[PDB]
Amino acid sequence: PTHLSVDTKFKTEGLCVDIPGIPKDMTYRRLISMMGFKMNYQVNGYPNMFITREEAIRHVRAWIGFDVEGCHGTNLPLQLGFSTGVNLVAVPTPLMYKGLPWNVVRIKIVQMLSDTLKNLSDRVVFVLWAHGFELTSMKYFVKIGPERTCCLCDRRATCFSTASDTYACWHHSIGFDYVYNPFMIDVQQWGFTGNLQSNHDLYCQVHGNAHVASCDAIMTRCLAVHECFVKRVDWTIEYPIIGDELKINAACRKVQHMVVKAALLADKFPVLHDIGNPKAIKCVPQADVEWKFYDAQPCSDKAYKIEELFYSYHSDKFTDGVCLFWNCNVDRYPANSIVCRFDTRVLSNLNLPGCDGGSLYVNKHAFHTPAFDKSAFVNLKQLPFFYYSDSPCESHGIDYVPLKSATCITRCNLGGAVCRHHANEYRLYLDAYNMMISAGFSLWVYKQFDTYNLWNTFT
Ligand SMILES: Cc1cc(F)ccc1CS(N)(=O)=O
Ligand SMILES: [Zn+2]
Ligand SMILES: [Zn+2]
Ligand SMILES: [Zn+2]
């Protein structure tokens, strides 16, 4: 049961206003035929245009909400809306485009999907709240057949060109006019009461209904993200490497060790309260401090209320020492904290738009993250960049320019001249730091944190 059987039943009630008289008894096999596509008993990698909820979740990076609204049905213009915010008007003859024939609309769809998806996925999954017009419009810009490879590379084909009779992936599709072998899922098949807007608005206030097709497309995809990543969470699902995932994760571990080690050296806290991932390990294993762990899985819906994490009767005294919240998202951090908080507003290939201001951060696993909120950090300050090292000044073993920097907290810098080892390590650390920040992570610390307190650790 890897793929969705074409003989599975499709509920047609949501389609009967656009398609009156539609049979109640319907399979994906008959629906695909009604849509004008012919499968031809083909076991060549494309068993069904529609996919299961499980297959959709594995391909969340490919999700593109799609809605079609009748402007005036073969005789009337259609408004094609996508979760990218694009609206195209196709004539049968929040970016809005004037009425144009299908032969040119299809070229724009291919360009838009290719630019949106080339750095995200090997395919497209059209996320629908199917009412009819969207399914009957697909024959005008979609071609199907056996699974194919790109004419210029080894990636699977996502586009077809009627001009050259060739196939291309999202990276090599310039000038292509048909979407080839797309996938799709109808959110209405999951069991819902009432319309799209009423279900969407139960969980989200950030997307409105400006009464255009792209608004519906955005709400449809937001509702699907809510159902699959907020109300239901699966950390077993692995996602492929598409960018700097490995460097980002390594940078996060390097920064965590640095910041916590320096906070413990600078303020000598007798106890550290490590709140968050139940599989956390001590990030500064050689530190003297009493290390106490508190389990909290990553919150996917709303940030944790500090009152619920700390109260209702553990050291009990979280006010003693320091609290470490490494990606443990709370409504208001206590004043004695060290925090790493993902900024959902960051633009990247790893960060997808999410539900109610949240974002879906996909890096090995999918993490729906509640909306970034500057008021969570009112008791703290931004953690400035610094590099600290107590390791010996010794090279061992890449050409050099002498390092001069007030933030290189080492014995050699205290002595007036940064050594080659500490200059190389500082530059590698700065690159790791910049990688983590650019990925969207933000760092915050208790207001008394002062790197001037690190210089006396060199006695
Ligand atoms: C974005 C992110 C990355 C990560 F590695 C761990 C957690 C989070 C945020 S959370 N706890 O809301 O899922
Ligand atoms: Zn290619
Ligand atoms: Zn929404
Ligand atoms: Zn040195």
Radius of gyration: 27 Å
Instruction: Please give the alpha-carbon distance between the first and last residues.
Output: 67 Å
Shape: elongated
Strand content: 15-25%
Helical/strand content category: alpha/beta
What is the helix tally?
10
- Major beta sheet, specifics? 7 strands, mixed
Bound small-molecule species = 1-(4-fluoro-2-methylphenyl)methanesulfonamide, zinc ion
List the domain count as a whole number. 2
Write down how many β-strands occur, each being a DSSP E stretch of 2 or more residues: 22
Give helix % range.
Answer: 10-25%
Catalytic activity: a 5'-end (5'-triphosphoguanosine)-ribonucleoside in mRNA + S-adenosyl-L-methionine = a 5'-end (N(7)-methyl 5'-triphosphoguanosine)-ribonucleoside in mRNA + S-adenosyl-L-homocysteine
Subunit structure: Interacts (via N-terminus) with DDX1. Interacts with nsp10.
Subcellular location: Host cytoplasm; Host endoplasmic reticulum
Protein name: Guanine-N7 methyltransferase nsp14
Task: Give your account of this protein's structure.
It is a single chain. This protein is α/β, with parallel strands linked by helices. It folds into 2 domains: 13-230, no CATH class; 245-457, no CATH class. The chain is built from 10 helices and 22 strands. The protein has helices at residues 28-34, 53-58, 102-117, 133-137, 196-201, 213-230, 245-267, 306-310, 411-414, 420-438; strands spanning 63-70, 78-82, 86-91, 95-96, 100-101, 125-128, 142-143, 159-161, 166-168, 178-180, 183-186, 271-276, 290-295, 322-326, 337-342, 351-353, 359-363, 365-369, 380-382, 387-388, 408-409, 441-446. The strands form 5 sheets. Strands 1, 2, 3, 4, 5, 6 and 11 form a 7-stranded mixed β-sheet that branches. Strands 13-12-14-15-22-19 form a 6-stranded mixed β-sheet. Strands 7-10-8-9 form a 4-stranded mixed β-sheet, with helices on one face. The termini are far apart. The protein binds 1-(4-fluoro-2-methylphenyl)methanesulfonamide and zinc ion (ZN) (3 copies). Residues 393, 410-412, 419, 421-422 line the site of one zinc ion (ZN). The site of one zinc ion has 7 residues, from helix 6. It comes from Severe acute respiratory syndrome coronavirus 2. It is found in: Host cytoplasm; Host endoplasmic reticulum. The active site is at 67, 69, 134, 211, 216. It catalyses: a 5'-end (5'-triphosphoguanosine)-ribonucleoside in mRNA + S-adenosyl-L-methionine = a 5'-end (N(7)-methyl 5'-triphosphoguanosine)-ribonucleoside in mRNA + S-adenosyl-L-homocysteine.
